[PDB]
A = this chain, B = another copy of it.
Amino acid sequence: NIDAISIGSNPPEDVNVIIEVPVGGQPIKYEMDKKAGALIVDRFLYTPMTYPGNYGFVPHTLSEDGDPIDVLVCNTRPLIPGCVINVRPIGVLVMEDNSGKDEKIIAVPSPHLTRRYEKIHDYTDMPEITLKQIAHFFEHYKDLEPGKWVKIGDWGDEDYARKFIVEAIERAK
């Protein structure tokens, strides 16, 4: 029951992410179905790529496209699909594609879950390799889909991420 999962303790300082796909996962897109509480296969992709972090959404949020906001958790160990992890947003991967703007929050596990990301506050605090892996996956994983293109824009910082999350919380209400 996704209705019982809070947005967070003190959003947007922390948000809860319901995980859909693990880091290292195949480029098979899954979408959670609210009523069923089940992950639905949405599309198989054929690029030779793997998800560059754990990927999910924040419940009770709404993007302008009418979906909950997506979050790439940039840790290294795989998480179980359907689990919930509390995270600190640190930035936004800002893109444009065929259908317009596409923005993905970048987040690390919250500090009560691990010391590893204690001192990471903004996307620029992550290693440049990790940032580029994230951008590269989302830029290219749809390349073998006819006509689908992605342009990577200027990244949003930690303050932009907080604003974007609050906007989506408001938009859901």
Measured CB to CB, the residues of A under 8 A from B are 1-2, 4-5, 18, 26, 28, 30, 33, 35-44, 46-52, 75-86, 109, 113-116, 127-129, 132-133, 136-137, 140, 143-144
Q: Report the nearest B residue to A19, measured CB to CB.
A: B41
Given contacts A44-B114, A84-B38, contact A5 B18 (CB under 8 A): no
Closest chain-B Cβ to A46's Cβ sits at a distance in Å of: 5
In contact, A84 and B144 (Cβ under 8 angstroms): no
A77's partner among B28, B38, B114 (CB-CB below 8 A) is B28
**In the complex, chain B residues whose CB is within 8 Å of the CB of A114:** 43-44, 46
Complex CA gap A47/B78 in Å reads 16
- A81 to B127 alpha-carbon distance, docked (Å): 28
Q: Given the interface contacts A33-B5, A133-B46, does A41 sit within 8 Å of B77 by beta carbon?
A: no
A-B pairs, 9 with minimum CB distance:
A4-B36, A4-B35, A44-B114, A41-B85, A39-B83, A48-B52, A80-B81, A48-B137, A40-B84
Contact between B46 and A48, CB atoms less than 8 A apart: no
A2 to chain B, nearest CB (A): 7
A77 to B133, CA, bound (A): 15
Q: What's the nearest-Cβ distance from chain B to residue A58, in Å?
A: 14
Across the two chains, which residue of chain B brings its CB closest to A114? B44
- What are 24 of the A-B contact pairs (CB < 8 Å)? A1-B37, A1-B38, A5-B36, A28-B79, A33-B84, A38-B83, A39-B83, A39-B84, A40-B84, A41-B79, A41-B84, A41-B86, A42-B113, A44-B113, A46-B129, A48-B51, A48-B52, A48-B136, A48-B137, A49-B50, A76-B76, A80-B81, A81-B82, A136-B144
